[PDB]
């Protein structure tokens with residue numbers, strides 16, 4: 103099942119999982135401080151992932167950076 | 172199942188899911204602000220995705236820029 | 241299952257779904273304003289999709305523009 | 310399941326599907342005007358597709374233009 | 378399931394389907410006029426396809442012209 | 445299933461299908477005339493194909509000419 | 513089923529497993545010391561992996577170095 | 583399921599099929615004359631194939647000549 | 650299923666398999682002497698591999714040296 | 717299911733099959749003479765293959781010569 | 784499953800199979816003499832293979848050499 107790579111470039115980065123199914127909501131928010139990496143998969147409970155803050159992200163489609171503020 | 176990456180290039184971008192099945196309507200609209208990144212899958216509930224607002228998008232098939240009015 | 245990417249290159253583009261089965265009719269028409277992106281899959285209800293209006297399109301087989309007059 | 314992309318290079322192109330099974334006949338004819346794009350799959354009901362008129366076509370095996 | 382692309386480069390091309398199973402015969406023949414394209418699959422009823430006439434042919438294995 | 449492209453570069457080319465199973469015998473022989481193309485599969489009834497005559501052949505593994 | 517390659521570049525790196533399911537919490541931390549390599553999969557119990565401290569990571573998507581503190 | 587392409591470089595080439603299962607023994611030998619091509623598959627009955635004669639062979643793994 | 654290649658560069662390398670399940674603990678420790686190669690898979694019992702000592706490692710994502 | 721290509725490079729080359737299962741023993745040894753090709757699969761009966769003699773070998777992992 | 788390719792580069796090369804299961808023990812040791820090639824699979828009974836001796840190894844992930 104796919105996964106995404108997130109590296110925080112700053113303190114307080116947020117990787118939020120949104121619930122799978124009929125409803126759409128935040129079920130979990132993982133805080134990442136500067137330099138930490140989170141490797142997260144799409145699962146039965148998570149069908150969309152939002153990154154808040156400055157981070158460096160890798161997926162099967164390539165590299166992208168979110169930006170804070 | 173496949174997924175799309177959307178980076179908001181401006182405030183208030185909308186990432187909108189359209190219902191799977193015989194009936195077709197928007198079931199959810201995730202608002203993104205400038206620099207935030209949304210990674211979203213095609214699921215049991217979502218069979219088409221619409222982006223409104225200025226964003227940068229990556230999919231299996233290439234990259235695309237959406238633009239606001 | 242596969243999807244197509246459509247960017248409207250003018251207001252009023254139409255993205256139309258053709259019914260899966262022994263009959264073929266339009267069951268849905270999604271309207272796109274200039275700059276808006278629709279990412280759409282081939283589903284249990286849709287086995288053919290028709291684009292009307294000027295649009296930039298990307299599929300698994302490459303890019304193509306649609307032109308209407 | 311595979312699909313074909315068809316862009317009408319003139320008014321009145323026809324995208325015709327042929328019925329899957331022991332019988333072969335046309336079951337449907339989608340007409341395209343100039344510039345319009347049809348993206349169509351192979352289905353439980355369609356196992357062959359015929360395009361008539363001038364069109365620009367894309368498949369897994371490459372590009373091809375039809376001429377009426 | 379695999380398919381073939383056939384463009385007729387003259388009138389009267391004929392794309393013939395041969396039956397699947399223990400017996401082998403033509404079960405259909407689709408004529409093509411100059412410039413017409415047929416995109417056809419291998420199916421529960423068709424395990425072999427024969428092209429007669431002048432045609433520009435595309436498959437998984439490459440391009441081929443029939444003469 | 446996989447298939448084989450066979451174009452005849454002379455008259456009388458023969459595409460022979462051999463039986464799948466514990467016994468091995470030809471069960472069908474499709475005759476090709478110069479220029480014709482035959483696109484056939486491996487199937488429940490055919491597990492080896494033999495080509496007699498001069499032909500241009502394409503498979504998953506590449507081109508190859510037969511001489512007969 | 514996918515896996516991640518982790519090499520500690522300093523002592524006291526932790527590779528943390530996040531539980532699969534409606535709840536999300538750390539169920540395990542593997543300590544790595546400088547030069548040690550952990551090769552770990554996504555599983556029935558782990559659906560997200562967090563690396564603390566300096567490490568050199570290889571996944572299907574390429575290379576990345578963690579630099580988190582402590 | 584896979585196959586091998588075998589072209590006879592001389593008369594009398596022989597493509598032999600060895601049985602699948604606990605016993606190994608040849609169950610067929612298709613003779614090929616100079617120029618003839620045999621396209622054959624690994625099947626329920628064949629788990630190994632021996633070529634005797636001068637043949638040009640094509641597999642998933644590349645080309646090889648038998649001598 | 651996936652595997653890793655481990656070449657010991659020094660006597661005493663220790664290849665540790667960690668338990669698949671809710672609990673994580675080493676279930677086996679395989680020691681290698683300098684120059685030996687262990688080729689190991691992920692399996693129903695092993696979901697994580699830990700490598701102590703100086704070794705040369707090959708996986709699907711590339712090469713890496715434990716130190 | 718995968719296979720390997722074995723070309724004998726001298727008379728008396730030997731292709732040995734090892735049993736699948738808890739026990740491991742040879743259950744068949746197919747002798748090849750100079751220039752002959754054997755194309756063999758991993759099967760329900762064979763989980764490992766040993767080559768004895770001077771042989772040219774192609775697998776999915778590349779070419780190798782036995783000595 | 785996948786397989787490894789092992790060629791003995793000296794006499795007495797030992798290819799050891801480790802048991803699949805909750806327990807991990809050697810269940811077999813194939814002895815290889817210089818020049819002999821053993822091509823082995825991961826199986827129902829083998830989940831990990833050890834090579835002792837100077838041997839030339841090919842896997843999906845490339846070549847590697849064990850040294851005696």
Ligand SMILES: N[C@@H](Cc1c[nH]c2ccccc12)C(=O)O
Pocket residue numbers: 120121122123124125126127149150186187188189199200201211212213214215216217220
């Ligand atoms: N609950 C939605 C979450 C989602 C995934 N992809 C989306 C795209 C747009 C909007 C919402 C979504 C779903 O499972 O379908």
Ligand SMILES: N[C@@H](Cc1c[nH]c2ccccc12)C(=O)O
Pocket residue numbers: 189190191192193194195196218219255256257258268269270280281282283284285286289
């Ligand atoms: N509910 C529709 C939505 C849809 C998906 N792809 C489309 C393409 C065109 C029009 C509508 C759609 C469906 O499941 O089919």
Ligand SMILES: N[C@@H](Cc1c[nH]c2ccccc12)C(=O)O
Pocket residue numbers: 258259260261262263264265287288324325326327337338339349350351352353354355358
């Ligand atoms: N109802 C048709 C619609 C269709 C799909 N592909 C086509 C190609 C040509 C004509 C019609 C179609 C079907 O499901 O088969």
Ligand SMILES: N[C@@H](Cc1c[nH]c2ccccc12)C(=O)O
Pocket residue numbers: 327328329330331332333334356357392393394395405406407417418419420421422423426
């Ligand atoms: N009824 C046919 C239509 C067809 C598909 N591919 C063909 C090739 C040649 C002739 C006819 C066909 C089928 O299902 O088999």
Ligand SMILES: N[C@@H](Cc1c[nH]c2ccccc12)C(=O)O
Pocket residue numbers: 395396397398399400401424425459460461462472473474484485486487488489490493
């Ligand atoms: N009836 C044959 C038709 C066929 C397929 N491939 C062939 C190759 C050679 C000769 C005939 C065939 C089949 O289904 O098996």
Ligand SMILES: N[C@@H](Cc1c[nH]c2ccccc12)C(=O)O
Pocket residue numbers: 462463464465466467468491492597598599610611612622623624625626627628631
């Ligand atoms: N009846 C044999 C035909 C065959 C296929 N591949 C072969 C290779 C060699 C000899 C015979 C064959 C089979 O189905 O098994």
Ligand SMILES: N[C@@H](Cc1c[nH]c2ccccc12)C(=O)O
Pocket residue numbers: 117118119120130131132142143144145146147148151530531532533534535536537559560
């Ligand atoms: N408990 C969560 C963990 C998770 C995986 N990927 C995530 C992305 C964001 C937030 C949480 C997660 C799950 O199994 O879905």
Ligand SMILES: N[C@@H](Cc1c[nH]c2ccccc12)C(=O)O
Pocket residue numbers: 600601602603604605606607629630731732733734744745746756757758759760761762765
């Ligand atoms: N009867 C054997 C034949 C065989 C296949 N591959 C082999 C390799 C070596 C020796 C014999 C064989 C089997 O099915 O396994």
Ligand SMILES: N[C@@H](Cc1c[nH]c2ccccc12)C(=O)O
Pocket residue numbers: 664665666667677678679689690691692693694695698801802803804805806807808830831
């Ligand atoms: N009994 C173990 C053998 C094993 C395979 N890979 C390993 C990696 C590390 C330690 C032991 C192993 C297993 O099947 O689970």
Ligand SMILES: N[C@@H](Cc1c[nH]c2ccccc12)C(=O)O
Pocket residue numbers: 527528529530540541542552553554555556557558561667668669670671672673674696697
């Ligand atoms: N008990 C764990 C072992 C594990 C695999 N991957 C991990 C990543 C981090 C922490 C522990 C692990 C599991 O199977 O889930």
Ligand SMILES: N[C@@H](Cc1c[nH]c2ccccc12)C(=O)O
Pocket residue numbers: 734735736737738739740741763764798799800801811812813823824825826827828829832
């Ligand atoms: N009976 C053993 C044969 C074998 C295959 N691969 C091996 C690797 C090493 C030792 C023995 C083997 C098995 O099927 O597992």
